Amino acid sequence: YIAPNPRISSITLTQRITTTGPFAILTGSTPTAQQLNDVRKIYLALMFPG
Amino acid sequence: KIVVTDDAKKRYKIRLQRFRTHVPKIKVLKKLIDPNRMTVRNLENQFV
């Protein structure tokens, strides 16, 4: 798994620091093991349509 | 002249040291840090 450039979220989602919203709150999250397993499940469902 | 280049590793190190100095662990454990302070909110996007 590869991650996007952090500056994309730096210049768009946290462009104003005086306010907070759903995306700004969620950018501070770090996944656990079961959530990474869920990501693998999502990709497996994507590669086998239907 | 204070010089900072575009390299990501040095900027990450500078960000980590600044976070340590502005938000030390001992103040976090004792619940002594105010997250709504302007100089704390500014640290999100300083040297990205």
Partner: peptide, 15 residues
């Protein structure tokens, strides 16, 4: 460890 986010800091200390 990893560099913290200012949004996660208030979540942690609010507890």
């Amino acid at each position: 460890g990893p560099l913290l986010s200012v949004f996660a800091l208030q979540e942690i200390m609010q507890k």
